[PDB]
Amino acid sequence: KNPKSDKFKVKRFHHIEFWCGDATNVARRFSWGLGMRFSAKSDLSTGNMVHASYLLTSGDLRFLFTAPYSPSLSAGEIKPTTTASIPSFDHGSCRSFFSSHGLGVRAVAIEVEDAESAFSISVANGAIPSSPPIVLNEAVTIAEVKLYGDVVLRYVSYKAEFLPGFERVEDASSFPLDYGIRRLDHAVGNVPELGPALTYVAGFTGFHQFAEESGLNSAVLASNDEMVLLPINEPVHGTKRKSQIQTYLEHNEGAGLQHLALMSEDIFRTLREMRKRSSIGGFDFMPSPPPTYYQNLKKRVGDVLSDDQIKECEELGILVDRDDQGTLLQIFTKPLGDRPTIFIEIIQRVGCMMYQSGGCGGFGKGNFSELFKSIEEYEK
Amino acid sequence: KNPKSDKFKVKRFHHIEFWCGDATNVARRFSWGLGMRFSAKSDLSTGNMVHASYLLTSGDLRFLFTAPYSPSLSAGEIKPTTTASIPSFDHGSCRSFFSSHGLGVRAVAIEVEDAESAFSISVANGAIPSSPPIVLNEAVTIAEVKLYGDVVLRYVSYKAEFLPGFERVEDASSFPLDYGIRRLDHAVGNVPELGPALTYVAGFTGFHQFAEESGLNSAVLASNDEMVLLPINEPVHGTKRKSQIQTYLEHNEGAGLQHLALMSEDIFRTLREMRKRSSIGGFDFMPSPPPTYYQNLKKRVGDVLSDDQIKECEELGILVDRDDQGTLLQIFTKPLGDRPTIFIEIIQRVGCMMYQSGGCGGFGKGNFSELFKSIEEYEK
Ligand SMILES: Cc1c(C(=O)C2=C(O)CCCC2=O)ccc2c1c(=O)n(CCCc1ccccc1)c(=O)n2C
Numbered sequence: 064k065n066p067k068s069d070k071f072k073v074k075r076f077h078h079i080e081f082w083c084g085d086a087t088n089v090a091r092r093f094s095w096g097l098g099m100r101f102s103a104k105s106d107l108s109t110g111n112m113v114h115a116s117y118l119l120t121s122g123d124l125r126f127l128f129t130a131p132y133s134p135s136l137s138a139g140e141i142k143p144t145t146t147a148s149i150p151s152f153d154h155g156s157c158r159s160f161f162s163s164h165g166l167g168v169r170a171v172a173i174e175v176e177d178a179e180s181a182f183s184i185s186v187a188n189g190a191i192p193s194s195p196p197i198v199l200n201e202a203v204t205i206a207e208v209k210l211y212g213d214v215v216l217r218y219v220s221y222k223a224e225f226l227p228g229f230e231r232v233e234d235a236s237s238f239p240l241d242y243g244i245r246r247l248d249h250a251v252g253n254v255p256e257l258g259p260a261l262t263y264v265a266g267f268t269g270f271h272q273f274a275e276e277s278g279l280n281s282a283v284l285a286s287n288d289e290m291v292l293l294p295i296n297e298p299v300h301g302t303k304r305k306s307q308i309q310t311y312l313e314h315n316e317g318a319g320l321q322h323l324a325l326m327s328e329d330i331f332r333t334l335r336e337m338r339k340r341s342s343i344g345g346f347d348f349m350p351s352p353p354p355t356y357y358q359n360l361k362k363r364v365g366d367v368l369s370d371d372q373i374k375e376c377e378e379l380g381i382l383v384d385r386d387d388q389g390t391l392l393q394i395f396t397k398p399l400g401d402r403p404t405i406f407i408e409i410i411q412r413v414g415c416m417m418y419q420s421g422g423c424g425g426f427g428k429g430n431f432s433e434l435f436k437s438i439e440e441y442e443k
Numbered sequence: 444k445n446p447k448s449d450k451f452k453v454k455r456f457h458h459i460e461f462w463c464g465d466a467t468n469v470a471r472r473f474s475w476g477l478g479m480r481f482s483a484k485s486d487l488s489t490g491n492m493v494h495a496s497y498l499l500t501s502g503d504l505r506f507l508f509t510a511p512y513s514p515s516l517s518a519g520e521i522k523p524t525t526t527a528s529i530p531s532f533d534h535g536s537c538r539s540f541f542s543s544h545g546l547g548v549r550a551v552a553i554e555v556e557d558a559e560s561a562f563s564i565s566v567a568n569g570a571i572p573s574s575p576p577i578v579l580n581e582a583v584t585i586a587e588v589k590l591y592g593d594v595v596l597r598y599v600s601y602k603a604e605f606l607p608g609f610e611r612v613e614d615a616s617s618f619p620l621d622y623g624i625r626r627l628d629h630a631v632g633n634v635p636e637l638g639p640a641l642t643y644v645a646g647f648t649g650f651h652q653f654a655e656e657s658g659l660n661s662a663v664l665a666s667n668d669e670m671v672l673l674p675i676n677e678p679v680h681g682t683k684r685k686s687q688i689q690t691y692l693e694h695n696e697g698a699g700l701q702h703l704a705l706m707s708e709d710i711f712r713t714l715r716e717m718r719k720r721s722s723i724g725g726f727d728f729m730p731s732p733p734p735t736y737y738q739n740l741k742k743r744v745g746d747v748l749s750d751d752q753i754k755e756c757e758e759l760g761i762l763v764d765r766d767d768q769g770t771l772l773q774i775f776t777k778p779l780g781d782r783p784t785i786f787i788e789i790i791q792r793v794g795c796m797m798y799q800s801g802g803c804g805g806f807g808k809g810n811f812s813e814l815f816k817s818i819e820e821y822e823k
């Protein structure tokens with residue numbers, strides 16, 4: 064049952080913005096590790112005396128990396144006279160965010176038909192304002208409201224290239240890397256209490272709960288066409304193994320974005336390319352499941368994957384689960400930075416063709432039981 | 444005239460420590476861009492609840508990357524009970540340093556015979572204490588005094604593997620990258636006033652001035668065997684082109700480390716390997732000199748370099764200058780991070796063999812005039 068109760072019209076995920084200490088070094092690491100191209104910049108070379116912001120792209124996926132300059136560079140400025148290309152940026156907010164949480168996602172940005180209306184409707188329906196709507200160069204409107212912890216849901220709307228004031232990067236600096244990642248599938252938050260978080264967000268968006276003992280309870284909020292998916296996790300305290308959600312909240316200093324799930328058009332090639340680079344500047348992956356997990360894969364997905372495609376999953380460490388509607392291939396990186404907080408999931412879905420409907424195959428929660436069983440069975 | 448007036452005994456450069464927001468992402472970028480191996484770590488996996496520190500090595504060059512965790516992780520700790528592996532670390536000092544300067548060098552570490560004595564003698568001779576001597580595991584002594592701005596000269600001494608509490612990285616995580624960089628040749632500071640900076644540092648070290656209109660005045664302080672070299676720059680105000688030193692001080696919020704010069708055993712291979720990676724996560728280089736610069740190279744270094752070796756300099760953008768004692772090959776990267784502050788120089792020296800004596804060939808100040816002339820001559 065999808066009641067299609069969105070209180071405004073939302074199209075798709077637009078971009079994810081990381082707040083960093085040095086946007087240059089994070090963006091270069093991410094670009095090599097994930098195969099994303101340098102697409103746009105807004106910094107001193109473009110006249111921005113406030114923040115440095117570098118955009119990476121792969122397919123429709125857009126990662127923005129932003130860090131503050133010395134406030135002394137822009138001391139004569141006031142908001143009306145700002146050189147910032149993102150008007151919601153604030154030196155003090157960014158330094159406090161990064162000091163408190165370390166490297167992580169500040170904004171989950173979705174594209175809307177009209178950012179002003181979406182902001183107005185949101186706050187009228189309980190959203191806590193963060194940045195009022197601002198129209199940039201009579202071309203793009205952006206607005207922000209609180210999502211959970213210190214993360215904002217950013218609304219972006221275009222009348223008719225990323226943002227005004229950003230410049231497209233010179234080809235010489237822009238090497239056409241691509242490992243097959245194509246778009247953002249879902250973005251997941253960790254909170255101390257799931258219930259109030261769900262009521263708050265679903266309260267101001269109209270998003271509905273998407274149809275779905277290992278450290279968490281979870282639920283998924285979705286847009287009308289279920290292309291925007293926002294799962295939220297809480298910890299289950301009192302187990303024997305400590306909750307990974309609780310560990311997150313402790314090292315993150317509270318609620319925040321846990322993982323970004325990036326859809327690949329060819330997960331086998333994406334994982335081959337990322338695993339080649341794991342020890343030369345890229346991203347590490349979580350430990351692989353035992354061969355027991357893959358021997359048991361034939362009995363569950365042997366209808367969808369060949370034996371050659373299943374052993375290819377085994378050499379790459381890919382996990383597989385299944386809904387009644389589709390099949391899911393997934394794998395998780397190790398944490399993206401110093402703290403055991405944010406990580407990335409690489410994903411590709413098969414089935415539910417009509418295009419492919421969103422969430423086809425679920426989110427892989429059945430892989431918790433399958434991994435534990437496979438692990439214990441492997442031991443004995 | 445080398446009066447050999449060192450007030451204690453110093454061996455060589457030991458390591459350079461960067462203070463970062465996220466030590467993981469800076470270290471991975473540097474490792475790929477410069478060809479340095481992950482050699483040691485001190486972080487949560489080693490029991491350090493205070494800071495994350497990752498060591499990269501190439502030859503005798505050691506780069507340390509350190510960032511603070513949430514103070515909440517170590518709130519019950521006091522200095523006697525600390526889990527920090529570097530006892531001079533302080534959450535507040537590091538966050539304030541990085542907020543003020545951005546990514547840059549906190550410590551220039553030199554190896555001494557006895558760090559306690561070197562600290563005592565230094566402060567008795569005018570040095571401003573920063574961190575008193577501390578003996579780690581009855582094995583290593585470290586101490587720190589102020590050098591310029593917020594950079595410290597760190598003394599390290601070993602009775603008889605980087606530091607106690609650091610672990611050697613698992614081979615699987617440690618990919619044997621190497622582009623030919625072998626050691627730190629010199630480390631350069633930018634200050635507002637050269638005179639007082641020189642008197643202060645030479646005052647407490649006993650270092651002597653090493654034998655030597657484009658934006659700076661400079662002078663070089665050296666150890667007894669002239670293996671430790673510490674040039675210092677000041678701006679020359681009132682030119683037509685603005686001083687790069689003054690631009691540094693403005694964006695850095697005052698005095699600090701301008702560049703690190705890394706000696707290569709094969710600069711041609713180092714530059715080939717680094718230039719291959721410039722647009723895929725590595726380091727960019729300053730613009731190359733015009734062909735005019737290289738046509739004029741034959742008349743000045745045609746005795747030392749073949750025509751094949753000279754055109755190889757031309758394809759890599761390498762600069763060449765000469766003392767009366769030796770010849771210098773050098774090239775400069777673009778800034779290492781967001782701000783136009785710190786950069787890196789790659790260097791290789793030829794001549795003055797006895798081993799090679801330090802500073803053989805100078806520091807390339809004659810390349811300021813040669814580049815300008817070559818540039819103007821190229822135009823017309
Ligand atoms: C995150 C995830 C998902 C996932 O994507 C997902 C959502 O999209 C929405 C609904 C809830 C949810 O969980 C699916 C399966 C997963 C994991 C996962 O993290 N781990 C590793 C667990 C060890 C661990 C150690 C340390 C820190 C974190 C974790 C798994 O083993 N499985 C099977």
Ligand SMILES: Cc1c(C(=O)C2=C(O)CCCC2=O)ccc2c1c(=O)n(CCCc1ccccc1)c(=O)n2C
Nearest residue numbers: 631661662674676687702775788806807808810811814
């Ligand atoms: C730094 C250097 C050295 C050098 O190493 C050195 C020392 O070791 C010690 C003594 C003084 C000194 O200068 C030598 C030659 C150099 C440069 C250099 O920076 N530039 C680029 C200038 C444009 C520029 C733009 C923006 C920001 C900075 C600079 C050059 O053109 N030349 C020829």
Ligand SMILES: [Co+2]
Nearest residue numbers: 251324408426
């Ligand atoms: Co997921």
Ligand SMILES: [Co+2]
Nearest residue numbers: 631704788806
């Ligand atoms: Co130099």
